[PDB]
Amino acid sequence: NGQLSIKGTQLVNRDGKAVQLKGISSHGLQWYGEYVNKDSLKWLRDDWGITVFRAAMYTADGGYIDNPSVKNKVKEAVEAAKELGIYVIIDWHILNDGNPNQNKEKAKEFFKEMSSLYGNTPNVIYEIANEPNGDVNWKRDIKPYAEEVISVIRKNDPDNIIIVGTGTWSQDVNDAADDQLKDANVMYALHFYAGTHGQFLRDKANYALSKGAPIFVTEWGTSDASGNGGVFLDQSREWLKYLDSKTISWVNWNLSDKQESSSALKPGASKTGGWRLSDLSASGTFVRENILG
Ligand SMILES: [Mn+2]
């Protein structure tokens, strides 16, 4: 494992071999941070074979902007990841606050603090803006934000991977690819839902890679885009086959018992892991099967 770096569009480990990370994301830490602890992460490492865990620290909706103490759960997750030898994504999970400039001063302060703490920790990956959305585009809105935040992180952490979200809920990776950041260790987020997104979205990804823009799927669901609507296993297989075909790392949404199809767990499932297959939802079962391979 160790230090990650990027060879062209390909994430590699410190040995210089290609690596395709696979894992699962928390739901918002202000609501479901109870599922995020050294016990549950260890169980995911050991039972599911995860090699990456995403700590989805919402900014809006009772998240870090209104109550910053949720940052202690991010640090808990990072310390768990270090002890367990897995990667951890620190995800500044914008959504209702769809332009990343809305909370930019607080993001910069947050990332200054995290890079300062974890700037020598190879476990950590920064995801600086989960899903830009609304009338928010790369050149005008998302790129200038990413430059300022990357500049902060790089003062403390010169080499860890930074993943930058793209327009239309991290769909418009082609627009990023036409105006790339210069940072040597940047990747662009692509998010999809198996019940909603299809070939048009793969073609955008293909276009971005052909331009040298690396892609990492920090969030995808087996559901349609609402997160409910049942599970689309055929489409999900087709998407994972496509990601495999390009060695694209991915992180499923989401580890929680929220009552909707994209949640991996059924209500009542332990907060500290050790789940029977009857504790897993249809999504959770599929996702776990695919991480194990
Ligand atoms: Mn580093």
Q: What is the resolution of this structure in A?
A: 2.0
Q: How many CB atoms lie within 10 A of CB 257?
A: 21
Query: Can you give 216-259 as a three-state secondary structure string?
Result: EEEEEECCCCCCCCCCCHHHHHHHHHHHHHCCCCEEEEEECCCC
**In terms of DSSP bridges, do strands 87-93 and 124-127 run parallel, antiparallel, or are they unpaired?**
parallel
Q: What is the CATH number of the domain that holds 16?
A: 3.20.20.80
Task: Answer yes or no: are the C-beta atoms of 191 and 239 closer than 8 Å.
Answer: no
DSSP one-letter string for 47-71: II--SEEEEEEESSTTSTTT-GGGH
Distance 182 CA to ligand 1 centre (A): 17
Q: How was this structure determined?
A: X-ray
Q: What is the DSSP letter of 188?
A: E
Contacts of 257 (CB under 8 A, 6+ apart): 32, 35, 263, 265, 266, 267, 268, 269
Which two structure tokens, joined as six digits, stand for 36?
Answer: 């995020």
Question: Does the annotation list 107 as a binding residue?
Answer: no
Question: Does the annotation list 223 as a binding residue?
Answer: no
Burial, 181: exposed, middle or buried (Cβ in 10 Å; 0-12, 13-18, 19+)? middle
Contacts of 171 (CB under 8 A, 6+ apart): 190, 191, 192, 197, 201, 204
Which two structure tokens, joined as six digits, stand for 1?
Answer: 């494992």
**How many domains is the chain partitioned into structurally?**
1
Residue found by looking up tokens 């998407």 in the block: 239
Q: What is the DSSP letter of 45?
A: I
Q: Measure the CA–CA gap between 44 and 88, rounded to whole angstroms.
A: 13
Catalytically annotated residue among 34, 109, 148, 219: 219
Q: Measure the CA–CA gap between 64 and 261, rounded to whole angstroms.
A: 26
Question: Does the annotation list 43 as a binding residue?
Answer: no
Q: Measure the CA–CA gap between 153 and 111, rounded to whole angstroms.
A: 6
Question: Does the annotation list 235 as a binding residue?
Answer: no
DSSP one-letter string for 65-129: TT-GGGHHHHHHHHHHHHHHT-EEEEEEE-SSS-SGGGGHHHHHHHHHHHHHHHTT-TTEEEE--
Task: Answer yes or no: are the C-beta atoms of 183 and 214 closer than 8 Å.
Answer: no
Q: Measure the CA–CA gap between 60 and 134, rounded to whole angstroms.
A: 15
Burial, 194: exposed, middle or buried (Cβ in 10 Å; 0-12, 13-18, 19+)? buried
Q: What domain range includes position 10?
A: 1-293
Distance 4 CA to ligand 1 centre (A): 9
Whether 76 is catalytic: no
Q: Measure the CA–CA gap between 193 and 225, rounded to whole angstroms.
A: 5
Q: Measure the CA–CA gap between 182 and 176, rounded to whole angstroms.
A: 12
Distance 94 CA to ligand 1 centre (A): 24
